Design an enzyme around this catalytic site. Sequence first.
Site, PDB file in Angstrom:
ATOM      1  N   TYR A   1      44.811 -50.133 -27.527  1.00  0.00           N
ATOM      2  CA  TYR A   1      45.022 -51.497 -28.021  1.00  0.00           C
ATOM      3  C   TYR A   1      46.391 -51.644 -28.693  1.00  0.00           C
ATOM      4  O   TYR A   1      46.535 -52.247 -29.762  1.00  0.00           O
ATOM      5  CB  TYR A   1      43.877 -51.891 -28.961  1.00  0.00           C
ATOM      6  CG  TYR A   1      42.609 -52.053 -28.164  1.00  0.00           C
ATOM      7  CD1 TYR A   1      42.312 -53.264 -27.576  1.00  0.00           C
ATOM      8  CD2 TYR A   1      41.758 -50.982 -27.926  1.00  0.00           C
ATOM      9  CE1 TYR A   1      41.201 -53.434 -26.799  1.00  0.00           C
ATOM     10  CE2 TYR A   1      40.618 -51.140 -27.145  1.00  0.00           C
ATOM     11  CZ  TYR A   1      40.354 -52.374 -26.575  1.00  0.00           C
ATOM     12  OH  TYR A   1      39.239 -52.593 -25.790  1.00  0.00           O
TER      13      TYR A   1
ATOM     14  N   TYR B   1      29.970 -54.847 -29.149  1.00  0.00           N
ATOM     15  CA  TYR B   1      31.018 -54.186 -28.382  1.00  0.00           C
ATOM     16  C   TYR B   1      30.345 -53.197 -27.449  1.00  0.00           C
ATOM     17  O   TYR B   1      29.528 -52.389 -27.900  1.00  0.00           O
ATOM     18  CB  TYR B   1      32.021 -53.450 -29.280  1.00  0.00           C
ATOM     19  CG  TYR B   1      33.123 -52.800 -28.460  1.00  0.00           C
ATOM     20  CD1 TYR B   1      34.172 -53.562 -27.951  1.00  0.00           C
ATOM     21  CD2 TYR B   1      33.095 -51.438 -28.170  1.00  0.00           C
ATOM     22  CE1 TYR B   1      35.182 -52.987 -27.182  1.00  0.00           C
ATOM     23  CE2 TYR B   1      34.115 -50.846 -27.400  1.00  0.00           C
ATOM     24  CZ  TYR B   1      35.140 -51.629 -26.911  1.00  0.00           C
ATOM     25  OH  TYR B   1      36.131 -51.046 -26.149  1.00  0.00           O
TER      26      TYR B   1
ATOM     27  N   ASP C   1      22.251 -50.145 -26.017  1.00  0.00           N
ATOM     28  CA  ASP C   1      23.484 -49.372 -25.958  1.00  0.00           C
ATOM     29  C   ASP C   1      23.521 -48.520 -27.221  1.00  0.00           C
ATOM     30  O   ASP C   1      23.863 -49.016 -28.299  1.00  0.00           O
ATOM     31  CB  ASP C   1      24.676 -50.322 -25.848  1.00  0.00           C
ATOM     32  CG  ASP C   1      26.012 -49.599 -25.826  1.00  0.00           C
ATOM     33  OD1 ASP C   1      26.041 -48.369 -26.071  1.00  0.00           O
ATOM     34  OD2 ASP C   1      27.041 -50.283 -25.602  1.00  0.00           O
TER      35      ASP C   1
ATOM     36  N   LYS D   1      29.646 -40.681 -26.684  1.00  0.00           N
ATOM     37  CA  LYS D   1      30.285 -40.264 -27.932  1.00  0.00           C
ATOM     38  C   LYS D   1      29.755 -38.926 -28.440  1.00  0.00           C
ATOM     39  O   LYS D   1      30.205 -37.873 -27.978  1.00  0.00           O
ATOM     40  CB  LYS D   1      30.130 -41.360 -28.998  1.00  0.00           C
ATOM     41  CG  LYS D   1      31.149 -42.494 -28.813  1.00  0.00           C
ATOM     42  CD  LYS D   1      30.991 -43.600 -29.858  1.00  0.00           C
ATOM     43  CE  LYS D   1      32.233 -44.480 -29.908  1.00  0.00           C
ATOM     44  NZ  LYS D   1      31.919 -45.834 -30.469  1.00  0.00           N
TER      45      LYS D   1
END
Lengths: 428, 428
Positions: free
Chosen positions: A19, A151, A248, A277
């Site tokens: 980003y 997200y 999620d 993760k």
Amino acid sequence: GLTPEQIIAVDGAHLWHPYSSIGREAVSPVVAVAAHGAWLTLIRDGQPIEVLDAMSSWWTAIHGHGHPALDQALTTQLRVMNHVMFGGLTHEPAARLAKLLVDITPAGLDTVFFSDSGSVSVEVAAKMALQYWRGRGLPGKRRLMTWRGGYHGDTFLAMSICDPHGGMHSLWTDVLAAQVFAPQVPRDYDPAYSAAFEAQLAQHAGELAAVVVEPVVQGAGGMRFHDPRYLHDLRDICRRYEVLLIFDEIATGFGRTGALFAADHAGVSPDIMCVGKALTGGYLSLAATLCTADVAHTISAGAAGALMHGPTFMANPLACAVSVASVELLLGQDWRTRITELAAGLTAGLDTARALPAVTDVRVCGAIGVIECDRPVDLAVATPAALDRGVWLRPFRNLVYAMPPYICTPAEITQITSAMVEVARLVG
Amino acid sequence: LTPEQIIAVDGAHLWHPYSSIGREAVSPVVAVAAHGAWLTLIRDGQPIEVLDAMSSWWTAIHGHGHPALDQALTTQLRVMNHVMFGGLTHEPAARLAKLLVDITPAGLDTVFFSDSGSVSVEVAAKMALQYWRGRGLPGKRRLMTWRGGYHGDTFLAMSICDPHGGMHSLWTDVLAAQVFAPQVPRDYDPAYSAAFEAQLAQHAGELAAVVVEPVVQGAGGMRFHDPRYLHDLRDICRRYEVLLIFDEIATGFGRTGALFAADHAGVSPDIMCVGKALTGGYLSLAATLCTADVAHTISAGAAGALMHGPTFMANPLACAVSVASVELLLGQDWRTRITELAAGLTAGLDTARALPAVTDVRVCGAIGVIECDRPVDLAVATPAALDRGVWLRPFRNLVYAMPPYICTPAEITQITSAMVEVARLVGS
């Protein structure tokens, strides 16, 4: 080889960061030269210094870096088989990891699709849900519904269920799939919220393949927590209106919220679940998408007859091997007590921030601690302040937060929280 | 776990690429080891050594367990497994970025690391869309390609897959609608390029980029085309102000006889994807490169940054083994090695031309293809090749190989012999 000065030169000229811009970053990146346990070795003013990885390298390093059991599991697999294609072949690391994941996830998740990142695992989950309804003869059920503040990654389908502001959808007008968004889920339980969610879903039920949410903790979209009872309501709404439920858990999995998976706080099972993760203990990128036998069989009996996905490095032996070790290492200790102590340490250490001028909230959930401020946190002020205290912190928006490795000692948590409180002090 | 135990877990709980659950006609073969160009597989309870003729789907260019790559991995593992790339940089990322900028077609000056090929294709599209938005032309948001291509399985990548014979054909109702030129021919024909330009001309105001695989189209049909078409695409794209994206995920790192397939035409794209052989086949990693002009136009735009950044971006372990794999390739006379492999494939596949079911035999670098007149049945092909000591994975009507660069002339002849015998059985 390169010196830190050479690394900075190459980096500034040739490397994109997340980003970020090329050539106009207000803060240049700091060279990291080592990582061991809960500590990173960073180069500050040409001096190597050790600092605490308060973010767990974005939730990943739950056992810390360079844990001897996980190093050993990787080196053991490296000596036998680095990688083979998963087309037509299977292997012991994939089998061992799949067995573990089906046993420890919420009840009924019986099949495992491996991929190489969280965003891909979300795309696989979406593909499972869409192909499921195609298998039921209802191809109009192809939209997704979520609540705001989420997200789910940054591939283009994952972007479509991102929070419209966090995901800067104004930059993507006429590009993204237009999904259904319910309002931000509140912290405290309010049945009126669920009744409104149900009324909105009911309107779209014939168009909707699935509801996709992060359970209990919304991470990259704002570090917000919500009552687990809302997940109980979602499970019920989805059952009654014939819409699949996707959780999620890429950020919430493997004990981080105080339960093995955050869905366990509500005692419900999704139809499809994503993990990533911390799956590998933060060594390598691996992710997985699990689904029920009903979902898997309905896909396999449809006209397509196959889930049309298959990444080159699917079920990579090295990544699966270190993940098996990371999972077994978590399950072989009293992880629930460990997280409880971490949460208590975070709560004790962050309490004095509640009285600061610019602080709007302080919240803790398992091994997650957050200070919400009333203005954006300036990285140029926060980063030297945290480094001076031996802590690597990465605020974003108005949030100073940490998700420390599970191996952090009480002193390390005190050091992390003290740096967080000071960053918030300097905001106001 | 024993091989029987692995088979039981796998049948119950593991999704395989492009497959069903419970309805696969051929169970997977258990792989227990990989060393050099050889896999150890379990057949009828006994271990057999077979050649990895597919390089584990184009990845294992130096073979498995090469000591230089094993050592680079264990060396990095002792120092730093992974750190977040937000606000930090590190020597493996800088070393790899410096190498990639130096060996790719001229002008590719910046590198975005991601975890898989499909993601790197999404990053390429995001670069092209944000580029034109940075120029105040957000209507330039469609992609153009030619038929027969394949670019991964995420939803944007699927939109430029071949829409009819391609594996993602059943999804076209939910994908972005892109512009498709006809299949590019093998031989150079100026009429094809004129037609391509005429078709691009009427869409130029809505096109962000042309996206193609240069010289070799892989997963879409192992078709080769004259490199002069890439010269024409570069000229068309520059004159009509459309960006040119090359997907070299399968063609990179020497596989077609040049270091990158674009080198056969001397062409530089504006954006380029690499993956697969990037890591020597050890770990999943991919990269997207773009020119300085693209990077600066994105960075100067209203977004101010490239809005992408996966959790495991620029993973030190994956970058470190890629550095070693690239250095190992560059430190030898790879061009002579590939020429010798191509000659071995050409010589060993020649007899297949006479077989009744064979319609074409073609070689390009270390790629060898027998094209048959009917779909190849895996239930016949897989044991026929295993009986001959070779792991082969036909798809559609193709018997093909992309062997590791370390294969000896005798090993190549063993591979081509098994391919000929598979083709012989196809017409039996």
